[PDB]
Amino acid sequence: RVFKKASPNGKLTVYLGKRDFVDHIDLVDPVDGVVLVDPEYLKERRVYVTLTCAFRYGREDLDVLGLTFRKDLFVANVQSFPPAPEDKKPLTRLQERLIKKLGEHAYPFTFEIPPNLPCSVTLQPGPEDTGKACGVDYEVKAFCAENLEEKIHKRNSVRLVIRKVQYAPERPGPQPTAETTRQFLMSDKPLHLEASLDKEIYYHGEPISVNVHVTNNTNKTVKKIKISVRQYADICLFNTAQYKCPVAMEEADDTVAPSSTFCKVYTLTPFLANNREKRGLALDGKLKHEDTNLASSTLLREGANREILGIIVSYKVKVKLVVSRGGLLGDLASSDVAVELPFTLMHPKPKEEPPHREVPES
Amino acid sequence: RVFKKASPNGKLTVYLGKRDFVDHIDLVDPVDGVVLVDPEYLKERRVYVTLTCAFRYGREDLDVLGLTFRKDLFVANVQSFPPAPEDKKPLTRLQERLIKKLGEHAYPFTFEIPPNLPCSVTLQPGPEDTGKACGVDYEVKAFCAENLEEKIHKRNSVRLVIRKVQYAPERPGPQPTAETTRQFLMSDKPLHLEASLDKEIYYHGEPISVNVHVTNNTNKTVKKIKISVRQYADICLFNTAQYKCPVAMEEADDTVAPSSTFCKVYTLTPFLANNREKRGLALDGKLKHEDTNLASSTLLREGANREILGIIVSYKVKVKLVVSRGGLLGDLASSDVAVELPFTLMHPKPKEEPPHREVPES
Amino acid sequence: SFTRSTVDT
Amino acid sequence: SFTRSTVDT
Amino acid sequence: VQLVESGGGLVQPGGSLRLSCAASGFNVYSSSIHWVRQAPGKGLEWVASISSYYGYTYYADSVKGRFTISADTSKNTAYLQMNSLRAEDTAVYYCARSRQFWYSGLDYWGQGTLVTV
Amino acid sequence: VQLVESGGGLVQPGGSLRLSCAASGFNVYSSSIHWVRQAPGKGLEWVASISSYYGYTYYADSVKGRFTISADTSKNTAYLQMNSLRAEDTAVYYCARSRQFWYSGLDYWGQGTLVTV
Amino acid sequence: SDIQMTQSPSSLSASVGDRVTITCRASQSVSSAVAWYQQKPGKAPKLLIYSASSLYSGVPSRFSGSRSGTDFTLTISSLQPEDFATYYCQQYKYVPVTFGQGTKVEI
Amino acid sequence: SDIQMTQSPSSLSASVGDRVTITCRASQSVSSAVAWYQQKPGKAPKLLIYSASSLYSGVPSRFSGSRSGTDFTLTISSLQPEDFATYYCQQYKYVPVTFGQGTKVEI
């Protein structure tokens, strides 16, 4: 089965074989489709197709709601009705079947998304928002006009929202481990902390288990141990911005006495049910106002990282120890100890079909 | 006039010409004095003098009050009663006349404090504290014993607390200026902030005037402007510690509109009356439980900074702008802008006298 | 306005 | 126990 | 990986009952747990559902207001609270599980707990 | 640099008066401000003091409980609040200033205000 | 909206090795979101097909499903002696999730 | 504790160019913490000496102060015609700060 859409006039129609185009880091899946035309009612003499990755965001200074500004991250276009000699490409398996079914008045088009481009990520809108989805999204548009610069009339065009998604790697990396050794003023005996996760790659909804090991040789007791999962999102619209948002946490009232060790295993599970109120939280790209999970981690093209546009999402686990206060300095010094563990959160590769859209609808 | 002290037994006495020894950074004033002995009442065959810079601090794990742990920073000693042929040094102007007054049974002693040593700084004790003064202090001790390591008796020795202080340099440095340029995600127009003080050097009780200039071309308003004076103290007892304590602050409800400038002059004056509750605040070294002002800045020996022992005190002024929140990210990003200005807080060189201890006593 | 579905036979 | 003062004549 | 339920039994009409379904091998955040009942000799019928990742609960129109479903993630157990049991609420109840990402049918089922009213 | 005070005047015994001393050229944090009074034809007598850096106030034994001294930093002014003025509180009051770091006598004096009871 | 998944025949009889086709019809379009289950008397239903054409893991290859508009069909290439059970047809695109009335296959 | 600073003579007479010595005695030891003031009739007192021997800035060098135990002495080398004023002796080591009764120098 393939998807199709028609203009409000009904004289133009574009077909797509899928909506989610997988990104293999090295190369993205081609975007292919078939356009149905009617030459008798197309005295415009041209039909154009267009692919556009655009950052869309709602203004804060402007009082009017719904209105949003946009910036093009990548734009491509194609001739389809008059067969362009330069745009000759071999037809894909589905495209030639679509041609054979629809007949003479149906023409193909193909794009190739270049690597190092943002994946579809939607920032979570607050309860006061009513406009279109914010963040990075892709859109395929087909229209008819005597020229590129001619004013576009919605009546004579179509548009579909498509996504560029990534799935978990086939082989996990080394087990993430991290440790720190705080040394206090009172004595030359250090406070030692270690942590590690079971594995590098976690799936959405899978519980994250954190191992904590403490060796307290100092004279200060540990009051509390705090574990949290934080979502790091980097935005490169005009200038690099950085924000951190916690998505799950656990505070344990465990204490470590001087000259004693301590070991425990904590469990966490980031999920969206208890994060509904966090405006600006990054979520996986939406085609419409449906519900989607927390944004999956973005895989960078090894050591390229050429300040990728759009949004880059990553996760870490922070283990923090609350240390008692007093003595000479009291409340003035910073006595806490902390360490962070990075990890990856992603979907596994689906067997046959693209992700579905709220399978049982309300 | 000179100061003198006698042992509880009364057979030994040591004279000093002053209590505050100035440090000129390049070389410290010599510590000189005269010991009055009694050979018939002294069959010990020796009389010793000692100079000791010691870090004293009250333990936190130990529940016993008054008891403190002590560490030597620099220790020196001298033979005084049997005139040591190897310890011959020329007599100072005061020392020879003290010899002339006291007669045959009075012997001199002189020390030379090496450079790059801590200045007397006392950490502020809390209301629950009862022990001796904490921090770095100097002490001159004269005792009698057949050997260095023989057990010392409290009744057979004397001890005086002396200080090593520094005064303001003769000429001020360049006027401290600092600026920053924050660029926001929404637009390519920056939020610009500048600040500067009138002069580098300030005295104790002299008001500090801060000049603030803001050029806001962004789309976000500035909610508040916050100015504060913070005391930085570095302790290198075993390992380098670092704490920051605010000693004076001022919050102004000033706002800057987009595409508009702003300028104002704020005034601050650090003082101890409103900082009584801040435990651990660094104060000038005390001889007893008297009252003393905020710790004066320590002048480092140019580019040596070989992790000077004890406590190193420095001050800064922080100018902070509170920027409004909202839009795409809302409460997740850090929108505030800040800049810091360093300055020096010291006494001027006294005309003829050294400090006096709570001149009108209660 | 509605993205419909179809089969390529 | 008391640090007294004097003049050196 | 198994689903086991307990709590069903004979009860008077208008009373109340608790059905608990213990999940092993998978967690409630990664799965959506459903309750399906089958009247004696009749076909299957869906009664309730819950999705812990999104925090949503759904009920059949015939049992809205009477039943209430919750899942406690500390031990991976889902509870169905039945109140005001009518005479026609007798059936054999199965605990079922479907993948949260994404729904592909009820692959794992319970083993049947009976409610007699 | 100069000290000036105002507020003195005729009053009935048991009443109250306000003496304000305006300081210029130095700030109250770096100086300690004292009040010294001189009965007609008699010698000087100290009545009150205040040190804004340490936050201490001192009064003579003859005026304890009656007088109260405060200094407002915003305009470098020191106030002496006199209550229950007895018949012997008549004098010529001088505002005085001494260095906070450190006391070296009263180098700057006021012009003299008269309180007649 | 409620969708009636009319499933026919109500019951059929077939011999070993025969080819059996079961039809299930929806009152409204449900896309390809249809699942098939097999229940033996007294036991929990066992999933066979999802997405109306995708065979569930571990199910023998003789079970196949097809779609044609809103008419979904389950077909068994060669009916083995262990396949004489009851089959239920389910649509999972709209809440409430409605099952078919069920078909019984008997010797 | 309060300290009574007995200051004598209560009043003395001297001629221009004469050498005048003024004595101020404390009831207890006050170290060298003694100050001297000069007051002309109707005007504020002008500071002369602090620490009992240190000349205040701008004061003519003919003024000098000395200490001997608890007996503090103010001496004028050559009494200029403007010096005929009232002098007060102050101890500033203990609160309350007590001034001397004052001496008068007249033609």
Calculate the alpha carbon distances from B134 to B126, B138, B287, B289, E80 in Å.
Answer: 11, 12, 11, 11, 66
Nearest Cα of chain G lies from the Cα of E39 at a distance, in angstroms, of 12
State which residue of chain H sits closest to F43, comparing Cα positions.
H101
Cis-peptide into H9, omega within 30 deg: yes
SS (H, E, C) chain A: CEEEEECCCCCCEEEECCCEEEECCCCECCEEEEEECCHHHCCCCCCEEEEEEEEEEECCCCCCCCCEEEEEEEEEEEECCCCCCCCCCCCCHHHHHHHHHHCCCEEEEEECCCCCCCCCEEECCCCCCCCCCEEEEEEEEEECCCCCCCCCCHHHEEEEEEEEECCCCCCCCCCCEEEEEECCCCCCCCEEEEEEECCCEECCCCCEEEEEEEEECCCCCEEEEEEEEEEEEEECCCCCEEEEEEEEEEEECCCECCCEEEEEEEEECCCCHHHCCCCCCEEECCCCCCCCCECCCCCCCCCCCCCCCCEEEEEEEEEEEEECCCCCCCCCECCCEEEEEEEEECCCCCCCCCCCCCCCEC
The verdict on whether residue A224 carries a ligand-binding annotation is no
For chain C, the maximum distance between any two Cα atoms, rounded to a whole number of angstroms, is: 24
Q: Is residue B5 part of an annotated ligand binding site?
A: no
Nearest to G45 among E34, E104, E109 (CB): E109
How many domains in chain F? 1
Residue A320 assigned ligand-binding role? yes
Which residues in chain D touch residue B4, judged by CB atoms under 8 angstroms apart? 3-6
Contact between A4 and C3 using a beta-carbon 8 Å cutoff? yes
Ordered by where they begin, the domains of chain A are: 3-165 (2.60.40.840), 177-346 (2.60.40.640)
Can you give the CATH number for the domain in which G11 is found?
2.60.40.10
Residues in chain G within 8 Å Cβ distance of E110: 44
Please state the three-class secondary structure of chain B as a single string: CEEEEECCCCCCEEEECCCEEEECCCCECCEEEEEECCCCCCCCCCCEEEEEEEEEEECCCCCCCCCEEEEEEEEEEEECCCCCHHHCCCCCHHHHHHHHHHCCCEEEEEECCCCCCCCCEEECCCCCCCCCCEEEEEEEEEECCCCCCCCCCHHHEEEEEEEEECCCCCCCCCCCEEEEEEECCCCCCEEEEEEEECCCEECCCCCEEEEEEEEECCCCCEEEEEEEEEEEEEECCCCCEEEEEEEEEEEECCCECCCEEEEEEEEECCCCHHHCCCCCCEEECCCCCCCCCECCCCCCCCCCCCCCCCEEEEEEEEEEEEECCCCCCCCCCCCCEEEEEEEEECCCCCCCCCCCCCCCEC
Give the residue carrying structure tokens 């003859």: F62
Cβ–Cβ below 8 Å for B207 and F102: no
State the Cα–Cα distance between residues F29 and B273, nearest whole angstrom. Answer: 10
Q: G13: distance to nearest CA of chain A, Å? A: 34
Asked if A359's CB is within 8 angstroms of G33's CB, the reply is yes
Residues H54, H55, H57, CA angle at the centre, nearest 5°? 130
- Determine, for residues A361 and G51 on separate chains, whether the beta-carbon distance falls below 8 Å: no
Rounded distance between C-alpha atoms, residue A66 and residue A131, angstroms: 4
Distance (Å, whole) CA A342 – CA A195:
11
Task: Select from C4, E77, B274 the least CA-distant residue to A1.
Answer: C4
A346 is in an annotated binding site: no
Give the residue numbers spanning the domain of H52. 5-107
Those chains having 3 or more beta-carbon pairs within 8 angstroms of chain G are A, E
As a whole number of angstroms, the distance between CA A15 and CA A108 comes to 9
Strand B157-165, strand B20-22: pairing: parallel
Inter-chain touch D7–B5, beta carbons under 8 Å:
no
- Euclidean distance between CA atoms E20 and E71, whole angstroms: 9
Q: Among E45, E105, E112, whose Cβ lies nearest the Cβ of G44?
A: E112
Q: Which of B147, B154, B121, B140 is nearest to B18 (CA)?
A: B140
Technique that determined the structure: cryo-EM
User: A3 and C8 in contact by Cβ < 8 A?
Assistant: no
All chains having 3 or more CB pairs closer than 8 angstroms to chain D: B
User: In E16-66, which ranges are E strands?
Assistant: 16-24, 31-38, 44-51, 56-59
B353, B272 contact by CB (below 8 A): no
Q: What is the CATH number of the domain that holds F91?
A: 2.60.40.10
Among F93, F65, F91, smallest CA distance to F79 is for F93
Q: Chains A vs C: touching, with 3+ CB pairs under 8 Å?
A: yes
Give B207's contacts in chain F (Cβ within 8 Å): 27, 29
Q: In this complex, do E101 and A206 lie within 8 Å of one another by their Cβ atoms?
A: no
Q: Which domain holds residue F67?
A: 2-115
- The CA distances from residue A26 to A111, A114, A189, in Å, are 16, 9, 50
Q: Total domain count for chain H?
A: 1
**Residue B308 and residue B331: Cα distance in Å, rounded?**
43
